[PDB]
Amino acid sequence: SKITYTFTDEAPALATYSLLPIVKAFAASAGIDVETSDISLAGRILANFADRLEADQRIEDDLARLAVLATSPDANIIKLPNISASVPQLKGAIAELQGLGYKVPDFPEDPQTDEEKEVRARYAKILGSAVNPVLREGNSDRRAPAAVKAYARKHPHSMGKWSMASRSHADYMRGGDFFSSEQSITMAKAGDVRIEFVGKDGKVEVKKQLSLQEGEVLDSMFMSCGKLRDFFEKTLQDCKETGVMWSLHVKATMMKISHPIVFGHAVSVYYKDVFDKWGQLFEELGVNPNNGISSVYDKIKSLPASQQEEILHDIHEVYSHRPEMAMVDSVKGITNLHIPSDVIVDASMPAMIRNSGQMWGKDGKQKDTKAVMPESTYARIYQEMINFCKTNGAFDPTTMGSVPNVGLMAQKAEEYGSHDKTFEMTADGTMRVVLADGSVLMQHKVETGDIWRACQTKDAPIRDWVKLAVTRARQSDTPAIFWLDPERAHDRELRKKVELYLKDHDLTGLDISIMGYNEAIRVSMERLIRGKDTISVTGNVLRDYLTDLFPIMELGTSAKMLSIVPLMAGGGMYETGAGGSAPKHVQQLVEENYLRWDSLGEFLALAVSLEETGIKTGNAKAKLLGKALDEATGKLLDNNKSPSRKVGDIDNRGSHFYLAMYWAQALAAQNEDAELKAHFAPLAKALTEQEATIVAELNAVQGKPAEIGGYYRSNPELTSKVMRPSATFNAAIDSLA
Numbered sequence: 001s002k003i004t005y006t007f008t009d010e011a012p013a014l015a016t017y018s019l020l021p022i023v024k025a026f027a028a029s030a031g032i033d034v035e036t037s038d039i040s041l042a043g044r045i046l047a048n049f050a051d052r053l054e055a056d057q058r059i060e061d062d063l064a065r066l067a068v069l070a071t072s073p074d075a076n077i078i079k080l081p082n083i084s085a086s087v088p089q090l091k092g093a094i095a096e097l098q099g100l101g102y103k104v105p106d107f108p109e110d111p112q113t114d115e116e117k118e119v120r121a122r123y124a125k126i127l128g129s130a131v132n133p134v135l136r137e138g139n140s141d142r143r144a145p146a147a148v149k150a151y152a153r154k155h156p157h158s159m160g161k162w163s164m165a166s167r168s169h170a171d172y173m174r175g176g177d178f179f180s181s182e183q184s185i186t187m188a189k190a191g192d193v194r195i196e197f198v199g200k201d202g203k204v205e206v207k208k209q210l211s212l213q214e215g216e217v218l219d220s221m222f223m224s225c226g227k228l229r230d231f232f233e234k235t236l237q238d239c240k241e242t243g244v245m246w247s248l249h250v251k252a253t254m255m256k257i258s259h260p261i262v263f264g265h266a267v268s269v270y271y272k273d274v275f276d277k278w279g280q281l282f283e284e285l286g287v288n289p290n291n292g293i294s295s296v297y298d299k300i301k302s303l304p305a306s307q308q309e310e311i312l313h314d315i316h317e318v319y320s321h322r323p324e325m326a327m328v329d330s331v332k333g334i335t336n337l338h339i340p341s342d343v344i345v346d347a348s349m350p351a352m353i354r355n356s357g358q359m360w361g362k363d364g365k366q367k368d369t370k371a372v373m374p375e376s377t378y379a380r381i382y383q384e385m386i387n388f389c390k391t392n393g394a395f396d397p398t399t400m401g402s403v404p405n406v407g408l409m410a411q412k413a414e415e416y417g418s419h420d421k422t423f424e425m426t427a428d429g430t431m432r433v434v435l436a437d438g439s440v441l442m443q444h445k446v447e448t449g450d451i452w453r454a455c456q457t458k459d460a461p462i463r464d465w466v467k468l469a470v471t472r473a474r475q476s477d478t479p480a481i482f483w484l485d486p487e488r489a490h491d492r493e494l495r496k497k498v499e500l501y502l503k504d505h506d507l508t509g510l511d512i513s514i515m516g517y518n519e520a521i522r523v524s525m526e527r528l529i530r531g532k533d534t535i536s537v538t539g540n541v542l543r544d545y546l547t548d549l550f551p552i553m554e555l556g557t558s559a560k561m562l563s564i565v566p567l568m569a570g571g572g573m574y575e576t577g578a579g580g581s582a583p584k585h586v587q588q589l590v591e592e593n594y595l596r597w598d599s600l601g602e603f604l605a606l607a608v609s610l611e612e613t614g615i616k617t618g619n620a621k622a623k624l625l626g627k628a629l630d631e632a633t634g635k636l637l638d639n640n641k642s643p644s645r646k647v648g649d650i651d652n653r654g655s656h657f658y659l660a661m662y663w664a665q666a667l668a669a670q671n672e673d674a675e676l677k678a679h680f681a682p683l684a685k686a687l688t689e690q691e692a693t694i695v696a697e698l699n700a701v702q703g704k705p706a707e708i709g710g711y712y713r714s715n716p717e718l719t720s721k722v723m724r725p726s727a728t729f730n731a732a733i734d735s736l737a
């Protein structure tokens with residue numbers, strides 16, 4: 001009676017086959033119903049194309065149901081990481097469902113007819129981050145629990161040594177990006193607004209109309225595609241002169257519209273010699289550089305070997321005139337520019353800094369790198385961290401402090417809801433935003449090919465943000481900084497509200513300040529290295545970047561964080577860490593039947609999820625399920641029963657067993673409730689005694705390839721046997737309820 005559990009993609013999906021059955025049994029002992037909501041990428045494709053499925057094979061639209069549940073005050077969701085698909089990934093999902101019999105329409109890369117444009121629009125809703133903006137209806141409280149830090153200090157993860165002579169650096173545009181042109185206003189009263197275009201010849205197009213609440217913040221900006229292509233050529237030339245490897249770090253997944261244009265311009269510029277010679281044949285075949293260089297590799301298959309061989313050689317000649325670039329997989333030849341979703345800035349840049357500031361090249365060796373991030377707004381903080389490591393060495397998890405995050409995200413704050421307000425200018429002219437009484441609010445001169453966009457942030461999420469920041473500052477006794485850039489128009493609007501709403505709360509004994517981004521990360525890092533903590537209070541995007549960046553230094557992986565979402569209706573969402581769906585863990589499983597995914601983020605969320613039920617439902621026992629799990633996670637940390645990444649020990653599957661065994665024990669041991677004490681004694685010691693052959697039956701699989709049938713919609717019977725192979729263990733768990 002209250003817990004919704006999320007079935008997602010890739011590695012967390014496989015973890016859930018082993019872990020969810022154990023959760024359902026234990027939870028049942030407190031009279032708790034544990035629902036499964038399918039928000040996977042293939043599951044969402046079926047849910048939106050019901051009209052193309054036989055009624056018997058239709059499925060229920062779980063995202064829509066989960067989106068309504070998030071607005072109810074009874075919500076209790078456990079949210080595991082899920083895909084934000086690029087176009088290549090969507091094309092792969094469609095192709096797998098089609099080969100299973102579902103007649104779902106192909107993705108229309110060029111839609112000419114009106115019926116083609118409606119299939120495109122239906123698919124557009126499924127692309128990108130379709131889940132998180134719909135679920136996140138409170139702000140974000142993300143922090144490392146004390147026990148997790150204690151574990152990291154006793155068992156430090158590897159950290160690459162940093163040389164003061166390193167040549168690695170981050171490069172970003174100086175002029176010509178969003179940072180350069182940003183404008184922002186705050187509405188004094190509710191009202192309508194119009195997004196207008198006035199060309200040079202004088203033609204007017206009313207792009208969109210919007211209704212905004214009273215205290216609503218609205219921003220406006222554009223990027224010059226001319227200066228972008230210019231920038232790309234300069235970064236490539238510089239790498240060629242200096243001998244340092246080129247790399248690209250954007251967020252083409254979440255930034256559905258803008259960053260593929262950026263990604264595609266990087267491709268056009270990099271392989272410019274190929275696109276210049278074969279421009280017409282490529283436009284004929286429909287190659288789209290916004291999908292990566294893979295687009296060319298794919299579409300030339302329909303051509304004759306004589307002529308495609310001519311193209312494979314002209315690409316080789318680009319790689320001899322351009323600088324070396326980073327590799328996603330050196331063995332298979334998969335490049336940084338291959339598909340847009342491989343290298344995602346928030347995961348990739350912490351990986352590089354942790355690895356001595358280096359990435360892998362053509363030869364399989366790591367080397368110094370220029371990390372290209374065209375947009376200046378959030379690029380600059382990585383430069384401050386790169387220089388800090390050059391000067392002070394690599395971070396030390398043994399003595400390090402902590403940087404938690406309180407994050408503004410409710411109701412699609414800032415850049416997250418901006419995709420319906422984003423256009424690629426088709427002519428020279430100006431873009432403006434007018435009050436409908438004619439008053440011009442914001443204005444930009446633009447040129448053909450440039451990207452223009454606007455963003456909305458509402459006053460209620462902001463009040464909740466400031467309030468959550470003050471609470472955390474009091475609850476721990478730790479200074480907090482609002483990262484607001486004084487040269488950003490949007491951040492100046494935010495600062496008026498923050499300065500105002502801080503006065504609505506009692507600041508006695510509290511250290512709260514406001515700084516631009518570079519000063520804040522510098523102050524945070526200077527405190528960090530002296531063993532002290534700082535809370536970062538940031539907007540929506542920095543919430544993402546920093547809860548990847550600092551946790552990977554401190555803990556080795558994002559997945560070992562608490563991530564609590566107090567929903568504004570009164571409920572709660574508990575995300576299983578601050579990481580992603582670890583697609584590389586899938587390659588290892590299909591190939592040699594080891595899953596290194598660490599489910600600690602799940603255990604941590606679950607224990608908070610059960611205490612929430614206890615409080616809201618006054619379910620005394622379910623509250624005890626919680627602290628028995630805290631103990632359960634405690635002994636897993638204390639006894640280092642997490643997965644190692646060596647193929648002769650326990651993996652993800654074995655770790656769940658060890659969690660179940662101490663969770664059973666701590667309940668068989670306690671005397672607080674004689675019901676549950678007797679309830680879990682038959683399972684407790686049964687798991688204990690049989691421990692060695694459970695582990696042997698788990699570990700007996702390693703080595704052998706695992707044929708789960710499919711990737712995006714794997715075969716459930718097949719997949720479930722691959723993940724629950726200790727038939728000894730299964731009936732111990734089956735025979736609980």
Ligand SMILES: NC(=O)c1ccc[n+]([C@@H]2O[C@H](COP(=O)([O-])OP(=O)(O)OC[C@H]3O[C@@H](n4cnc5c(N)ncnc54)[C@H](OP(=O)(O)O)[C@@H]3O)[C@@H](O)[C@H]2O)c1
Pocket residue numbers: 080081082083084085132253341342343344347348557558559578579580581582583584585596597598599
């Ligand atoms: N739903 C969400 O809230 C969310 C958040 C972020 C990303 N994503 C999505 O997830 C997908 C992949 O993201 P990504 O490739 O950018 O990076 P990622 O999933 O964050 O992880 C990349 C690396 O992080 C490490 N890692 C992450 N979780 C781990 C865990 N539980 N245990 C051990 N190591 C872990 C792994 O390192 P090793 O190789 O060293 O083992 C992995 O290769 C994308 O499709 C993206 O859209 C979703």
Ligand SMILES: O=C(O)CCC(=O)C(=O)O
Pocket residue numbers: 084129132133253254543544578579
């Ligand atoms: O990682 C986060 O916290 C945000 C994830 C995200 O931005 C997305 O892809 O939707």
